Amino acid sequence: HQEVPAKFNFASDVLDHWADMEKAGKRPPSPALWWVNGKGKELMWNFRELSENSQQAANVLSGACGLQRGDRVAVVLPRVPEWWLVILGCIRAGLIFMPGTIQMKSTDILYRLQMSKAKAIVAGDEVIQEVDTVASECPSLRIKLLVSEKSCDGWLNFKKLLNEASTTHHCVETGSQEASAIYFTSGTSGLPKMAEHSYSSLGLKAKMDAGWTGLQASDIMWTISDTGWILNILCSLMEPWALGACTFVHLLPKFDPLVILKTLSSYPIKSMMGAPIVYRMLLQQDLSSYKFPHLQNCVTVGESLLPETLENWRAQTGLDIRESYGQTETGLTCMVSKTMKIKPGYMGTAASCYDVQIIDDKGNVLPPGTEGDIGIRVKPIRPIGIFSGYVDNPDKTAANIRGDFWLLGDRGIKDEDGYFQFMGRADDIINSSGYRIGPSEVENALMEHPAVVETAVISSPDPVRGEVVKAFVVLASQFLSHDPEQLTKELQQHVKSVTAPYKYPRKIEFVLNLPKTVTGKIQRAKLRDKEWK
Ligand SMILES: CC(C)Cc1ccc([C@H](C)C(=O)O)cc1
């Protein structure tokens, strides 16, 4: 059981507080969301406007579209203000939001809509055609909202409908444990499962963690995230808005480091968060021309921060990078908070709620200096912030609980001051550049190509990028004498076309055999260890 209030809602209990402060004069109109596209277009909302505009959103969803409390809404949008508006709208109307990346292809979308039985989808120009290819095969799908300068035949015009909606919406009295969002998350085999989070697991947690990033009421944070990542909800949205701070969003259509750098230099961003890869790319640029004295807090998550990266960032910029850790299922688990001593190679100590420990094969807590499995105590009291379980899959929610602990699937060592040292995934999940990729997803993709009679996909160290997807392939006999550079390029594009590109094998190595079990199952462990020295 849990020690929460009966009811909770981030929109009413947190965001509307900051709005009411402005309305009542107790605070000046303070910036809440500052958006830019990099082509001279910018837009900005104070908290009051954000409230009003997001009520319009909830009216559009529950009014004009008649979506009902508990209905599941897929959201597939680029970095545009409407995403933040749609998410707030869902929270207000009691609608379950299910973000996914705009990189998604049509099969990805079919899987997700069918498994979730989504009643609606909010999408942008990038994925309209892909949705439309498979939409008819999704019986539950009743509402298609498009966010776009163009109108389209079969899709409701979201922007038009928002302008017509009323700026008053009565927030649903949502329960603490009531489903708020479903994030699809990759597994060690098979296809993505549905991680369910409550109104309190996200919102209340985020309110209790408010400030962990060093951010403060009158500052600006720039989280750099794919809108389909849980990072975007916890860091880009809830963290700053729990504090009354401003959140910065750049469209960043092309993930260009020079663009990131100009933006840091040109705008008064005080805190920035982003996956390690971002900092590594920025260090390859000319930091001395593009300076940013205003920047105080740099945080990082979704990958192991290398001591080399940390050290250089210090050298070049005079700032520390503070590492943080977690997963879709647990949210912010560990971190180096602002006032903590930094220890290179360590990701910090337990987040406030959580009692985190290295546990053994039986489920018992281990001493410092001993490698084991990183876990969070969840019995008898599940702490605020833990998710509600995998949807329709109590079995697989259970398979991750050992004794009184939720297992994260990560190995680690804890030091004398309680700092965790990440020691690798215990299973086959791969972590590239902030994305979390299941191998069966990439393997299936390859297997649709006729040159691939057999394949096995693992993680692999790149000395520039970090952890990158590698594919071992077994070529059909009738492909052996091909140019391996071109074949590889071909195979890569094949993946880029059939599922989201972020999971495309950045390395491919051809072989005649693949090690297996004496039962037939492929030995990815054996291939990973050889790869990682
Ligand atoms: C605080 C938050 C960013 C924790 C966190 C860290 C990593 C992940 C990965 C990318 C996943 O998708 O499982 C999710 C959430």
Three-state secondary structure readout of 362-379: CCCECCCCCCEEEEEECC
Residue 385 Rama label (left phi>0; alpha psi -120 to 50; beta): left
- Contact indicator for 93, 67 with CB cutoff of 8 Å: yes
Ligand 1 centre distance from Cα of residue 52 (Å): 30
Q: How far apart are CA 178 and CA 169, in angstroms?
A: 20
The reply, when asked if residue 174 is annotated as ligand binding, is: no
Write out the two tokens for 401.
């609980």
Please calculate the CA angle 406-407-409 and round it to the nearest 5 degrees: 155
Pocket lined around ligand 1, Cβ cut-off 6 Å: 185, 229-231, 234, 301-302, 324, 326-328, 331-332, 434, 436
Q: What is the whole-number distance in angstroms between the Cα of residue 326 and the centre of ligand 1?
A: 5
Ligand 1 pocket test: which of 202, 223, 227, 229 has the largest number of ligand atoms within 8 Å of its C-beta? Answer: 229
**185, 301, 352, 410, best to mutate for ligand 1 pocket (most atoms within 8 Å of CB):** 301
Ligand 1 nearest-atom number relative to CA 183 = 12
- Give CA–CA dist 146/530, Å, rounded: 47
Q: Is 254 marked within a binding site? A: no
Q: 503's torsion region: left (phi>0), alpha (psi -120 to 50) or beta?
A: alpha
| Nearest ligand 1 atom to alpha carbon 435 | 10
Number of Cβ within 10 Å of residue 391's Cβ equals 18
For 127, other C-beta atoms within 10 Å of its C-beta total 23
- Return the CA Rg of the chain: 23
* Beta-sheet pairing, 401-402 with 405-414: antiparallel
Tokens 């055609």 belong to residue: 129
The DSSP symbol for 29 reads -
d(CA 310, CA 315): 9
Please state whether 331 falls in left (phi above 0), alpha (psi between -120 and 50) or beta.
left
Residue 327, annotated as binding a ligand: yes
CATH class of 427-533: alpha beta
- Resolution of the model in angstroms: 2.6
b/e code 483-514 from CB counts within 10 Å (16+ = b)? eeeebbeebbebbbebbbebbbbbbbebeeeb
Phi, psi dihedrals of residue 21, rounded to the nearest 5°: -65, -40
Closest C-alpha among 319, 411, 311, 337 to residue 370: 411
505 is in an annotated binding site: yes
Closest C-alpha to 196, from 389, 396, 392, 436: 389
Cα-to-centroid distance, 238 and ligand 1 (Å) = 15
Question: How remote is the CA of residue 60 from the centroid of ligand 1, in Å?
Answer: 30
Residue 380's SS3 state is: coil
* Three-class DSSP category at 498: helix
Contact 162, 138 (CB under 8 A): no
Report whether 466 belongs to an annotated binding site: no
Burial class (CB in 10 A: 0-12, 13-18, 19+), 30: middle
Q: How many Cα atoms occupy the beta-carbon half-sphere of 407 within 13 Å?
A: 22
Task: Give dist(CA 237, CA 4) in Å, integer.
Answer: 22
Beta strands 321-327 and 297-300 are: parallel
Superfamily of domain 1-426: ANL, N-terminal domain (3.40.50.12780)
Are the C-beta atoms of residues 67 and 172 closer than 8 Å to each other? no
How many angstroms does the Cα of residue 17 sit away from the middle of ligand 1? 28
**For residue 237, which of 20, 40, 437, 54 has the smallest C-alpha distance?**
54
List every span in the chain annotated with CATH 3.40.50.12780. 1-426
- 440-443 contacts: CB < 8 A, separation 24 or more? 440/187, 440/189, 440/190, 440/191, 441/186, 441/191, 441/192, 441/499, 441/503, 442/469, 442/471, 442/495, 442/499, 442/503, 442/504, 442/505, 443/471
Please count the other Cβ atoms lying within 10 Å of the Cβ belonging to residue 352. Answer: 13
Structure tokens given for 189: 């085999």
| Start and end residues for every CATH 3.30.300.30 domain found in the chain | 427-533
